[PDB]
Design a binder for this molecule. Structure first.
Ligand SMILES: CC(=O)/C(C)=C/C=C/C=C\C=C\C=C/C=C/C=C/C=C/C=C\C=C\C/C=C/C(=O)O
Length: 225
């Protein structure tokens, strides 16, 4: 049997994307915006550093994975019960078509998450370059050097959060297609791990509540960078 509800970590009690997991990187981004602008030696490096932070946040906003997930969860509330009914009716052609649709939506959300991870990992390579340039070019105390160090410390764990979201959603897409492929081939009740269409819908609805909240919190935050 295959799990059609959200998979870890999206099934976690605490939604995995938010200040709980990204707050150190958020703070670092706020500090980078507000760096002082009196130092001549640092000015160009600091502009480049600030543009790197801003590029990554802008990329994040373009993708908006939590907002996209929340939209999916709304769809899931009706799409999974409809699929479950097709499974129970041993309706292979219907189940396949419905699962294909669900999977398409899941894989688009997963790609958005993956795109955020890619932006962060690419940002880390920029920070690596900046760290070396500034260690030599900017001998004394410069808050931008700390901002680069912050990026190096926090970007890869942050990227991993998004990679794990991507992995979960891609697995959900695989599972829903695989489930529909069994319809008409084995007994219907052996296909899904869950005991009802409603149980599956409720699990996506619960995730949707969390994703919606985060989407709105993030929207606020990015508009002040
Ligand atoms: C090359 C050269 O000459 C020099 C000088 C390079 C210097 C580079 C310096 C810094 C680089 C930072 C890069 C990336 C930052 C990224 C910051 C990201 C912050 C993200 C914060 C929160 C994210 C929340 C996501 C929510 C989305 C959702 O829930 O949908």
């Amino acid at each position: 049997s295959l799990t059609l509800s959200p998979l870890p970590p999206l099934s976690n009690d605490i939604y995995p994307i938010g200040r709980n997991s990204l707050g150190n990187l958020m703070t670092a981004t706020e500090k980078a915006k507000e760096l002082p602008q009196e130092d001549k030696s640092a000015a160009q490096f600091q502009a480049t550093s600030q543009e790197s932070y801003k590029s990554a946040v802008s990329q994040t906003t373009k993708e908006s994975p939590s907002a996209s997930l929340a939209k999916f969860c709304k769809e899931a509330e009706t799409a999974y019960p409809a699929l479950y009914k097709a499974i129970q009716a041993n309706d292979s052609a219907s189940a396949k078509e419905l699962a294909k649709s669900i999977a398409s939506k899941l894989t688009e959300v997963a790609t958005r998450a993956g795109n955020v991870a890619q932006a962060y990992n690419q940002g880390a390579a920029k920070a690596q370059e900046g760290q070396k340039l500034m260690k030599s070019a900017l001998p004394g105390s410069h808050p931008v050097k700390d901002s680069v160090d912050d990026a190096l410390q926090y970007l890869s764990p942050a990227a991993q959060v998004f990679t794990s979201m991507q992995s979960s959603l891609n697995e959900s897409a695989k599972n829903v297609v695989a489930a529909a492929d069994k319809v008409g081939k084995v007994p219907a009740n052996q296909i899904a791990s869950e005991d009802s269409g409603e149980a599956i819908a409720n699990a996506w609805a619960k995730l949707g509540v969390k994703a919606t909240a985060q989407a709105e919190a993030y929207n606020k935050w990015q508009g002040n960078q």
